[PDB]
Design a protein around this ligand. Structure first.
Ligand SMILES: Nc1ncnc2c1ncn2[C@@H]1O[C@H](COP(=O)(O)OP(=O)(O)OP(=O)(O)O)[C@@H](O)[C@H]1O
Ligand SMILES: Nc1ncnc2c1ncn2[C@@H]1O[C@H](COP(=O)(O)OP(=O)(O)OP(=O)(O)O)[C@@H](O)[C@H]1O
Ligand SMILES: Nc1ncnc2c1ncn2[C@@H]1O[C@H](COP(=O)(O)OP(=O)(O)OP(=O)(O)O)[C@@H](O)[C@H]1O
Ligand SMILES: [Mg+2]
Ligand SMILES: [Mg+2]
Ligand SMILES: [Mg+2]
Ligand SMILES: [Mg+2]
Lengths: 105, 241, 245, 426, 52, 203, 238, 52, 385
């Protein structure tokens, strides 16, 4: 409720970059195949239509620090979150394809 | 739980503190007091023994609080210490004031009141110590009592507190006869103490003993502690050693 | 919650829920009704028995605080022994100091001063009572200067003057009846039968003098707690009146 | 021992005879299934059974493809997708052309997925996502479409239109009931005022509370008063949710209300189905999460709603998604709570109204003695008092009969703490 | 207010226009906002001094 | 442990050999035994000695049941405890569960506790029965009663509780006697010495 | 949780300590008081546990406050102990100040006042004892039987049972007893008091304890032999 | 991983390329013989919609 | 001797005749008909192959088809055809399918399943009209709720009230709550369902909610009925396992139970009985009052109540002249009714111990001290003294 979402869409639209939304609370699944698969679709899109700002919601459910939460496909989302950061170095640095991210704890 | 303090009761109105304090007495050794027609014998058990431990300087569970009434002790000994002194001081306060020695019932009543008083008010702890009061007063002649750590007293012709309370109680009452000779009172004490106790060889150093008589040295209440060499003999008469 | 474990701890409403709760202790105790008139205040009560072995003729719940100041109570009686004790002392110390009748209003304040005490200390009133009072009083009396007055002394709040007040268990339905049946035209005999009339309505018991007790403050008759015959007579008149109707 | 001994063996043989008697009996039962009007059904019955024409497997679409642009030929194409309408019509270096579209990928109820063609009865406008489709025993291909999911006919039961409930069948004229009126009726009559103020008119409400208050009775009450037709879904009575079955449960009834005007979509008891997900939990479910994702978007889409109001009752607000708790889905929140003295008077008066009892009783008199309570407990005092009354053989339950009934529920409360008080003499 | 985040702040203002609409007004005022706050909380808006 | 040898004979053999006598003379029939006391006392072996003389089934059920799944599940083999006990009656069942689970789940409630609660409780139903008694001699073994769950502990649907003692001087001597024959007999006889010297804490 | 102090109340206005104190009474054995026309008999269940235990040196359940006031109790034995000596002194302090034999009203009101004082306080529990305080006065011939409760509330009742399974004993007493006719003779007062106690003892005619108080400072405690004639008299009529 | 509850190792198909087989691709496998037949699009859910 | 002969006079001749009668009649049924019915049967057997795969009917589409879900993994659109009607079926009923090509060829089941078999019982009740004394009052509360609507519905109509639905028996073990329900059931002559609530639950998933449905479904076909779901505690708030293999099962199964009890209508014609240890082993709200009337708390026999239980036992055992009835009560202190039965079993074993044929004085005295020793506390009088 502190308007991260608000600023972020406002920042994207100013820079002449597209606002890719990655709905972190909707992407929750114990589905191992369908969990891994859908994340990469969202990224691929963002790259193509670059400049872009990806805004990634709550990290309290797609990549918990603690494993005393039962997760098996959100485990696989967590591994894909690293792969995204590596791929922003696909133009040198990360300037063209930038990522903002939000967490509440 | 509602064991946080004395003030607070459970749904059922019992107080856990009292309960713990009863259990404290039975984690220190058996103590047995027998009243007989011809004397009241006190006998107690040593919970401690090391090979280099000495116990010949003092009895750690027997104190005379007055020259006519003495107590055998069951419970934690630091707790015991404070109260032994409070009772003996109160005894002589009676002697100062009335120029005669304290009746048994008053003496017990005073300490259970103090002990209850710690439950009734304040932050102070209850003090789980059970004294077996063996005394003589002209009110009811020989009198053997014990005090509860629940802070009330009951008269007796025998009582056992300390370890194996159930075991000591049935065994004593089975070989009770309304009369009882003071020699048999001694003989009985030793026999029930061996069975209860997990040290197979009951030796004189595992024993504390006093016998209290006005049938010996008439017109005078005389409490006499046995020495080791006397305790050593009686064990051979009971056939332990 | 969490604001009912401190007596110096306020709720996020700014209130004390230790105190709030003591209002429900007042409501728990049995109904008391007072009705002031221009001729005197008539103070009636409810009692309850479970056995007929209860001596109902030697129990107090209307108490004499002076010979012209009386009170009814409702709530915890453990608290009430103390409350009524303080209030006796004040009336007596006034005549000690002054040789003149205490004021009804003045008495009302002093009572509420003892009520304020919830902990210890505090300036200008050294506090010695350790918990919330669980007792309210309907305070009725007479000083000349303000005539006959009825107040309800509220330990939680402070005193509110009433021209008629019901407290206890049956308070909500009584208050409405007492709106429609307090007048500036009440007579003392009529007030007496009025109190019984309201009591019965909210009493799920039997109306009898064994669980009722009228009393008046009339400054010319003194404080008179009534007899069993006297109250019995008022039960009888009540029934003939409402039979015709 | 001759009196009992001899008679013991005799007892025993009879029991054994009885056991044997039951196995003789059950080996023959009542003849057969033969019925003269279904002996004529037998004429058609031989032909179809021997023919290849039943059974049809139940499958259901789970994934839509477009049958060109799919990437079926893979010769000189790239990726997993083509041009999304062509893939073999712009090039014959594949060496093939095909003009098949809307092929669709089904799932069997054995959990095995297959792509199938289309019959002679099928066109792309007879098939959709989530619609049952019948396929062969052997080599598969859609023959006849079956209607979507198992939801139809089961939902209609739960929906009652135009309730026979008003604010006479609800006791108390409670605070929540006064805020409830403002949500449904006030912007329906006049959307002018809301527009001018510059607030967006209330249309979301969440009724929530402890059990037994009667959050539902009110909700029904106003549905009739506003004179709107009533559509009910109960998401803890209706427990179809499997792979977005409950999203089809939601869609139909919302979709139906939307075609009509002057409607109430009451989503009830959504603690499960369209409620909290159990990915986080040990349940592993996210089958109720499809139901959730659909529910949000239906609301959001409908907006401005043309004065058709979406209502919610859920027991706990802890079983809701925080997207619902953003405005434009839910706008008003009412916790139902214990009725006041007179409110409890009123619930007693309705219960008592149905009874045939002595009229000299006064409703206020009984509810005084009663503490603060739920309506469901005051239903219990009247039913209990009825039972005491017949037992004593009165055809009426006196004021006194209801005081005994009140007392027994209370006595139970006393049993769980401690009994006896100071109120036996005060 | 104190410790009201973005979402909450909007909740009181929108709420305060509803309240005003019921009263007979067709515009918001200062007092009505105050009333919006007393929904977030369980405080009574108007109660006599004898506990508050 | 003579006391125990005499009891388990009276309690188990007499109702099975003749049911008529126990019903004529007393009333009802015992539902079993709860054996408790120190571990090491040979409860199990003693009970195996009972099972052999009566000419009864055995089984012996080792621990909690979930473990067998080769056909079905172990939750329903408790249901089948009835079917098996009855057909092959006369049976003794030496049902084990030492209860090193503890007093934690005597109170509990919660956790995965409900399954083992179920296994224990539903076993209980078959014995007392809703008509017919399958077997009257299902037999419980455990180290203490405080660790024992209360449905099972509560008497009158399980009968008889017998406590083994930490062995006497007399008991030690008699246990010592039977094995020393198998061994070698000491010259001068020093079988007397051993029992004097110490009394074990178990058998 | 509001049963942690006497300075915290529940939303119903109770201090559960008092409520749990009433359950504590029930642990202690029953006591029964019944007045007649010219007496009060205060009778009680006594306990005989073992041959070792005595009676001489083993506390009575009746303690005499003075020569014209008597007191019975039920509760924990330790708690009543401090209360009785305390009660006795208060009783003496009446005469010290006023120089008159102790009033029974004065006595029930102060003694429960000690209880009340403790309950009022939040830092200390009060007692868990309910008592009967019965008596006469040399001036007043009216027989009085009073009650205390652990809240520090005193009440007066014609006849009462308190203690262990009191409720059941109560219902029997209601019926026989009338406020219009209490027992005329002393012996008859005793017969009823015994009939009530038979119920709580099960069997035990050494376990029924009778005391009688009449005006002009007459307190007697009945011999074992005398208590026994009633029991046998009640079995012949039974 | 088949939708016939196996996991199987199949010699690679000549028309399908090693470029258009990588982890998590959805694929046709021929029903008559398990050899890798064709390539299917990716499946989507209601969660994906929101992301666009 | 004379009256047990009279039981033999009534039972032997009537019963023995009944076996023999069935046995000839099985032949005799056949002989009246020799065409028509025989013919129709003959062609039913040609049509219906061997074996038949079981089905379960989900739903009927009105056009001479239906959809079944079968223990065969894929579902089927089957047809309704041949010796079956559209209205001879109802949804959710079990149907018989043709092996080769699935078709409903009729029904001979109609809710015939193994869980139905466990649930229905043909057993004799253990108690009949409170054979064993004590709890006189508690049975005159079950009876008001359960037995009384079945026996006379008219009395509730004059009263103008709806008639009760169900009872909840709870509290203490050894008080014979599970046996009072059996007593009440024999008194009416109602249909009794001993199903146990714990017999729906297994490791394997997804089976359970079927079982919950079937209970309410069968109970309504044979209504009037009394349903006893004994031990509904295990399926309470609690969980199967803290790992896996049961996170779902308890949650679905309980919820599904509340639903079809309410969904009948608020009936006073199918009663339920929930037997439970406490409400602390279940969820804090059930389904939750006005609807589940009445709740019966069992507590320990009092001196009157435990006398009554005892008098029954002692008379069926040799002697009572030795030790008075009263002397047994006096010695005992208050306990459940199992403890009273336990003293009598031990007494009988003690007569065996001596090798007597009389329950002597010595036997009574020991048997009383034994039970008290189990089952012991002494800090009630230790706090006090
Ligand atoms: N307002 C009321 N007027 C009359 N009776 C009432 C009222 N509220 C509840 N009751 C009684 O309680 C019964 C059951 O509760 P009801 O269906 O009203 O409650 P709810 O809290 O909406 O429930 P659930 O948790 O079952 O959805 C009603 O059938 C009725 O007899
Ligand atoms: N009374 C005896 N006579 C001879 N041997 C004995 C006796 N009692 C115990 N033993 C021996 O002591 C050993 C330990 O006993 P065992 O393991 O059979 O005990 P348990 O008390 O039934 O155990 P658990 O609690 O593990 O079920 C064995 O070697 C056994 O043979
Ligand atoms: N009113 C009564 N009806 C039936 N038996 C009774 C009655 N009162 C007491 N009993 C006694 O209680 C005994 C114990 O009954 P039982 O052990 O079956 O108890 P339960 O409460 O149903 O138990 P569980 O919790 O073990 O399922 C009966 O055998 C009988 O002696
Ligand atoms: Mg956001
Ligand atoms: Mg509802
Ligand atoms: Mg073993
Ligand atoms: Mg049972």
């Amino acid at each position: 409720g502190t308007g991260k979402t608000l600023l972020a869409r406002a920042c994207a639209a100013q820079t002449n970059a597209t606002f890719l939304k990655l709905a972190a609370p909707q992407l929750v699944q114990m589905y191992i195949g369908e969990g891994a698969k859908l994340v990469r679709d969202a990224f691929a899109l963002a790259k193509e239509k670059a400049p872009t700002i990806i805004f990634i919601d709550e990290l309290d459910a797609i990549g918990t620090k603690r494993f005393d939460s039962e997760k098996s496909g959100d485990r696989e989302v967590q591994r894909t979150m690293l792969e995204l950061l590596n791929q922003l170095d696909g133009f040198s640095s990360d300037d063209r394809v930038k990522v903002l991210a939000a967490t509440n704890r | 739980r509602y064991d946080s303090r004395t003030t607070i009761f459970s749904p059922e109105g019992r107080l856990y503190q009292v309960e713990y304090a009863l259990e404290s007495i039975s984690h220190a050794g058996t103590a047995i007091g027998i009243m007989a027609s011809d004397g009241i014998v006190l006998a107690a058990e040593r919970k401690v023994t090391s090979t280099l431990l000495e116990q010949d300087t003092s009895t750690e569970k027997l104190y005379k609080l007055n020259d006519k009434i003495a107590v055998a002790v069951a419970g934690l000994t630091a707790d015991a210490e404070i109260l032994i002194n409070t009772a003996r001081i109160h005894a002589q306060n009676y002697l100062k004031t009335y120029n005669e020695d304290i009746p048994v019932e008053i003496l017990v009543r005073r300490l259970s009141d103090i002990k209850q008083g710690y439950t009734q008010h304040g932050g102070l702890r209850p003090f789980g110590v059970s004294f077996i009061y063996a005394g003589y007063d002209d009110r009811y002649g020989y009198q053997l009592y014990t005090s509860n750590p629940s802070g009330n007293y009951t008269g007796w012709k025998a009582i056992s507190v300390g370890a194996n309370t159930s075991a000591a109680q049935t065994l004593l009452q089975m070989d009770y006869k309304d009369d009882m000779k003071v020699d048999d009172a001694i003989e009985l004490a030793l026999k029930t103490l061996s069975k209860t106790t997990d040290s197979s060889a009951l030796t004189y150093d595992r024993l504390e003993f006093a016998t209290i008589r006005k049938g010996a040295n008439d017109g005078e209440v005389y409490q006499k502690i046995f020495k080791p060499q006397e305790i050593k003999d009686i064990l051979v008469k009971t056939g332990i050693t | 919650s969490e604001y009912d474990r401190g007596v110096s701890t306020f709720s996020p409403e700014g209130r004390l829920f230790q105190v709030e709760y003591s209002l429900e202790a007042i409501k728990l105790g049995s109904t008391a009704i007072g009705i002031a008139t221009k001729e005197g205040v008539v103070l009636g009560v409810e009692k309850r028995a479970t056995s007929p072995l209860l001596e109902s003729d030697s129990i107090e719940k209307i108490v004499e605080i002076d010979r012209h100041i009386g009170c009814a109570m409702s709530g915890l009686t453990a608290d009430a022994r103390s409350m009524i004790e303080h209030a006796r002392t004040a009336a007596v110390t006034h005549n000690l100091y002054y040789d003149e009748d205490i004021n009804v209003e003045s008495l009302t304040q002093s009572v509420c001063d003892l009520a304020l005490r919830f902990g210890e200390g505090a300036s200008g009133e050294e506090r010695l009572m350790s918990r919330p009072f669980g007792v309210a009083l309907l305070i009725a009396g007479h000083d000349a200067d303000d005539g006959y007055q009825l107040f309800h002394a509220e330990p939680s709040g402070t005193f509110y003057r009433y021209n008629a007040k019901a407290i206890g268990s049956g308070s909500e339905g009584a208050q409405a009846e007492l709106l429609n049946e307090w007048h500036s035209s009440l007579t003392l005999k009529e007030a007496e039968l009025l109190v019984l009339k309201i009591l019965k309505q909210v009493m799920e018991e039997k109306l009898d003098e064994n669980n009722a007790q009228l009393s008046c403050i009339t400054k010319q008759d003194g404080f008179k707690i009534y007899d069993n015959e006297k109250t019995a007579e008022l039960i009888k008149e009540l029934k003939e009146k409402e039979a015709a109707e | 021992a001759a009196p009992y001994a001899a008679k013991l063996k005799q007892t025993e043989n009879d029991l054994k005879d009885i056991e044997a008697r039951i196995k003789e009996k059950a080996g023959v039962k009542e003849s057969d299934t033969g019925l003269a009007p279904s002996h004529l059904w037998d004429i058609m019955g031989d032909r179809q059974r021997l023919g290849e024409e039943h059974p049809l497997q139940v499958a259901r679409c789970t994934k839509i493809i477009k049958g060109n642009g799919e990437s079926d030929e893979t010769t000189t194409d790239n990726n997993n997708s083509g041009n999304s309408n062509s893939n073999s019509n712009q090039q014959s270096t594949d060496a093939d052309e095909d003009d098949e579209d809307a092929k669709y990928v089904i799932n069997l109820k054995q959990i095995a997925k297959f792509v199938v063609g289309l019959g002679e009865r099928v066109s792309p406008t007879d098939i959709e996502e989530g619609m049952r489709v019948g396929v062969d025993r052997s080599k598969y291909n859609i023959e006849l479409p079956l209607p979507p999911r198992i939801d139809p006919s089961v939902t209609m039961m739960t929906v009652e239109e135009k309730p026979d409930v008003t604010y006479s069948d609800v006791g108390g004229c409670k605070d929540q009931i006064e805020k409830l009126r403002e949500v449904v009726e006030l912007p329906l009559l006049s959307p002018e005022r809301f527009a001018t103020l510059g607030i967006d008119p209330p249309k979301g409400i969440l009724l929530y509370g402890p059990p037994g208050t009667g959050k539902t009775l009110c909700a029904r009450a106003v549905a009739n008063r506003t004179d709107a037709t009533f559509i009910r879904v109960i998401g803890s009575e209706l427990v179809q949710k499997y792979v977005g079955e409950g999203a089809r449960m939601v869609r139909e009834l919302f979709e139906m209300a939307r075609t009509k005007k002057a409607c109430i979509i009451f989503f009830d008891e959504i603690d499960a189905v369209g409620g909290a997900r159990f990915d986080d939990g040990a349940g592993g479910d996210n089958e109720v999460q499809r139901t959730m994702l659909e529910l949000i978007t239906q609301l959001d889409g409908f907006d401005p709603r043309g004065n058709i109001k979406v209502m919610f009752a859920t027991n706990r607000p802890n079983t809701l998604d925080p997207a619902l708790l953003r405005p434009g889905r839910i706008d008003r929140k009412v916790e139902f709570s214990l009725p006041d003295l007179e409110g409890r008077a009123n619930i007693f008066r309705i219960h008592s109204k149905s009874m045939s009892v002595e009229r000299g009783i006064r409703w206020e008199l009984i509810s005084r003695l009663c503490p603060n309570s739920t309506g469901a407990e005051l239903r219990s005092v009247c039913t209990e008092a009825g039972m005491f009354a017949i037992r004593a053989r009165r055809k009426v339950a006196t004021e006194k009969d209801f005081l005994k009934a009140v007392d027994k529920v209370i006595s139970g409360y006393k049993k769980f703490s401690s009994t006896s008080r100071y109120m036996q003499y005060n | 207010t104190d410790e009201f985040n973005g979402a909450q702040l909007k909740a009181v203002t929108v709420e305060a226009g509803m309240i005003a609409l019921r009263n007979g007004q067709s515009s918001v005022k200062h007092e009505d906002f105050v009333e919006g706050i007393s929904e977030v909380q369980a405080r009574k808006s108007k109660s006599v001094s004898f506990y508050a | 442990l003579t006391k125990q040898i005499k009891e388990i004979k009276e309690v188990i053999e007499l109702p099975v050999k003749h049911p008529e006598l126990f019903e004529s003379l007393g009333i009802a029939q015992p539902k079993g035994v709860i054996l408790y006391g120190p571990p090491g006392t040979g409860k199990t072996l003693l009970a195996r000695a009972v099972a052999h003389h009566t000419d009864c089934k055995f089984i012996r059920v080792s621990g909690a049941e979930l473990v067998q799944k080769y056909i079905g599940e172990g939750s329903r083999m408790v249901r089948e405890l009835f079917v098996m006990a009855r057909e092959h009656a006369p049976s003794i069942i030496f049902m084990d569960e030492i209860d090193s689970i503890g007093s934690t789940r005597v109170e509990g409630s919660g956790g995965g506790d409900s399954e083992v609660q179920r296994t224990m409780l539903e076993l209980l139903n078959q014995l007392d029965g809703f008509e017919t008694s399958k077997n009257i001699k299902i037999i419980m073994a455990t180290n203490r009663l405080d660790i024992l769950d209360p449905a099972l502990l509560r008497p009158g649907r399980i009968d008889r509780k017998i406590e083994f003692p930490p062995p006497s001087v007399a008991a030690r001597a008699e246990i010592l006697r039977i094995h020393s024959r198998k061994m070698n007999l000491t010259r001068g006889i020093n079988l007397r010495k051993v029992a004097e010297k110490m009394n074990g804490c178990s058998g | 949780g509001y049963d942690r102090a006497l300075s915290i109340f529940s939303p119903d206005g109770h201090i559960f300590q008092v409520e749990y104190a009433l359950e504590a009474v029930k642990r202690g054995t029953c006591a029964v008081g019944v007045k007649g026309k010219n007496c009060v008999v205060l009778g009680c269940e006594r306990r005989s546990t073992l041959k070792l235990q005595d009676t001489r040196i083993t506390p009575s359940k009746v303690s005499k406050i003075d020569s014209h006031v008597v007191l019975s109790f039920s509760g924990l034995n330790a708690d009543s102990r401090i209360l009785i000596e305390k009660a006795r002194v208060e009783a003496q302090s009446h005469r010290l100040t006023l120089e008159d034999p102790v009033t029974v009203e004065y006595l029930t009101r102060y003694v429960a006042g000690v209880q009340q004082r403790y309950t009022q306080s939040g830092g200390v529990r009060p007692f868990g004892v309910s008592t009967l305080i019965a008596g006469f006065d040399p001036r007043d011939d009216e027989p009085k039987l009073y009650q205390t409760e652990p809240s520090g509330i005193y009440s007066s009742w014609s006849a009462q049972t308190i203690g262990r399974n009191s409720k059941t004993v109560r219902e029997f007493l209601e019926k026989n007893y009338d406020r219009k006719e209490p027992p005329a003779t002393v012996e008859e007062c005793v017969k009823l008091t015994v009939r009530s106690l038979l119920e709580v003892v099960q069997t035990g005619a050494k376990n029924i304890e009778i005391t009688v108080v009449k005006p002009d400072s007459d307190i007697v405690a009945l011999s074992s032999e005398e208590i026994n004639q009633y029991v046998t008299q009640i079995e012949q009529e039974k | 991983k088949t939708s016939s509850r196996q996991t199987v190792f199949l010699p690679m198909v000549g028309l399908v390329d090693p470029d258009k087989l990588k982890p998590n691709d959805l694929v046709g496998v021929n029903k008559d013989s398990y050899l890798i037949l064709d390539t299917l699009p990716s499946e989507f859910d209601s969660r994906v919609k929101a992301m666009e | 001797t004379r009256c047990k002969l009279k039981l033999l006079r009534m039972e032997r001749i009537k019963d023995h005749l009944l076996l023999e009668e069935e046995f000839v009649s099985n032949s005799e049924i056949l002989k009246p008909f020799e065409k028509k019915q025989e013919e129709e049967k003959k062609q039913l057997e040609e049509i219906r192959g061997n074996p038949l795969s079981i089905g379960t009917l989900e739903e009927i589409i009105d056009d001479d088809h239906a959809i079944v879900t079968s223990p065969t993994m894929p579902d089927y659109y089957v047809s309704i055809l041949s010796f079956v009607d559209k209205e001879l079926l109802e949804p959710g009923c079990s149907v018989l399918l043709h092996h080769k090509t699935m078709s409903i060829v009729g029904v001979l089941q109609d809710d015939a399943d193994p869980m139905v078999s466990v649930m229905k019982m043909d057993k004799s009740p253990t108690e009949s009209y409170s054979d064993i004394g004590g709890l006189e009052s508690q049975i005159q509360e079950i009876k008001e709720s359960v037995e009384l609507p079945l026996t006379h519905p008219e009395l509730y109509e004059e009263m103008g009230i709806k008639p009760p639905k169900g009872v909840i028996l709870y509290g203490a073990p050894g008080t014979g709550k599970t046996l009072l329900a059996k007593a009440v059931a024999n008194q009416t002559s109602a249909t009794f369902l001993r199903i146990v609530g714990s017999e729906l639950i297994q490791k394997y998933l997804g089976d359970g909610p079927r079982l919950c449905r079937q209970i309410f479904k069968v109970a309504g076909e044979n209504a009037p009925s009394i349903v006893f779901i004994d031990e509904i505690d295990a399926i309470g708030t609690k969980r199967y396992d803290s790992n896996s293999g049961g996170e779902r099962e308890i949650q679905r199964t309980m919820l599904e139970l509340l639903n079809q009890l309410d969904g009948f209508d608020d009936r006073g014609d199918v009663k339920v009985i929930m037997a439970t240890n406490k409400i602390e082993t279940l969820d804090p709200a059930l389904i939750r009052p006005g609807r589940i009337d009445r709740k019966i708390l069992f507590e320990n026999p009092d001196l009157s109540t435990k006398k009554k239980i005892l008098g029954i036992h002692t008379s069926k055992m040799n002697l009572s002249e030795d030790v008075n009835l009263e002397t047994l009560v006096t010695t005992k202190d208050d306990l459940s009714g199992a403890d009273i039965q336990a003293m009598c079993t031990e007494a009988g074993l003690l007569a065996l111990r001596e090798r007597r044929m009389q329950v002597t004085a010595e036997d009574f005295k020991q048997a009383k001290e034994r039970v008290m020793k189990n089952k012991v506390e002494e800090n009630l009088e230790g706090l006090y003294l």
